[PDB]
Amino acid sequence: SGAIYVGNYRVVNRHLATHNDWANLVWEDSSRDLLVSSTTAQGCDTIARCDCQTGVYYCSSRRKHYPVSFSKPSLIFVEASEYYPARYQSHLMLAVGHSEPGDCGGILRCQHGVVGIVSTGGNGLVGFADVRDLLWLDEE
Numbered sequence: 259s260g261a262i263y264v265g266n267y268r269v270v271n272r273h274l275a276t277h278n279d280w281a282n283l284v285w286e287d288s289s290r291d292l293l294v295s296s297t298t299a300q301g302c303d304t305i306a307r308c309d310c311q312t313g314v315y316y317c318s319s320r321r322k323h324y325p326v327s328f329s330k331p332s333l334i335f336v337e338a339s340e341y342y343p344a345r346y347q348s349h350l351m352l353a354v355g356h357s358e359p360g361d362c363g364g365i366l367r368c369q370h371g372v373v374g375i376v377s378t379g380g381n382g383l384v385g386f387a388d389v390r391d392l393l394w395l396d397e398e
């Protein structure tokens with residue numbers, strides 16, 4: 259679990275969104291595994307606006323932050339889970355990093371701010387849903 263709190267927005271994995279998220283919905287995209295809801299309180303996270311490919315992510319199943327090298331956002335085949343069917347998830351970045359279902363939500367960050375959230379993984383893989391192109395998160 260986990261979210262990004264930027265301005266009056268809460269960014270979460272779409273597959274982990276709550277009823278309150280859906281009842282206060284700003285934007286969602288199943289192909290990206292992302293959902294954004296509105297908040298009453300202002301958040302403290304800042305979004306990175308860059309092309310970094312190195313950063314640090316939080317892994318809840320290890321209680322640790324790990325430095326990683328990650329690929330550029332791409333259209334990457336993701337195996338069927340109880341959450342989605344075979345398909346191609348867009349805007350996804352991969353790194354070598356131990357993950358588990360319950361790690362989705364953990365933040366990936368670089369020197370500029372928050373880059374994305376954990377979304378997928380596998381036998382020493384972890385994939386992150388990028389948020390750096392969502393420029394509107396910085397306003398309103």
Ligand SMILES: CSc1ccccc1CC(=O)N1CCC[C@H](CF)C1
Pocket residue numbers: 273291336339340341342347357358359360361362376377378379380381384385
């Ligand atoms: C960190 S997720 C993970 C890690 C190790 C192994 C398996 C997973 C689960 C996983 O990959 N998915 C279930 C959640 C939704 C994802 C979007 F298509 C796909």
Ligand SMILES: [Zn+2]
Pocket residue numbers: 306307308309310368369370371
């Ligand atoms: Zn950066």
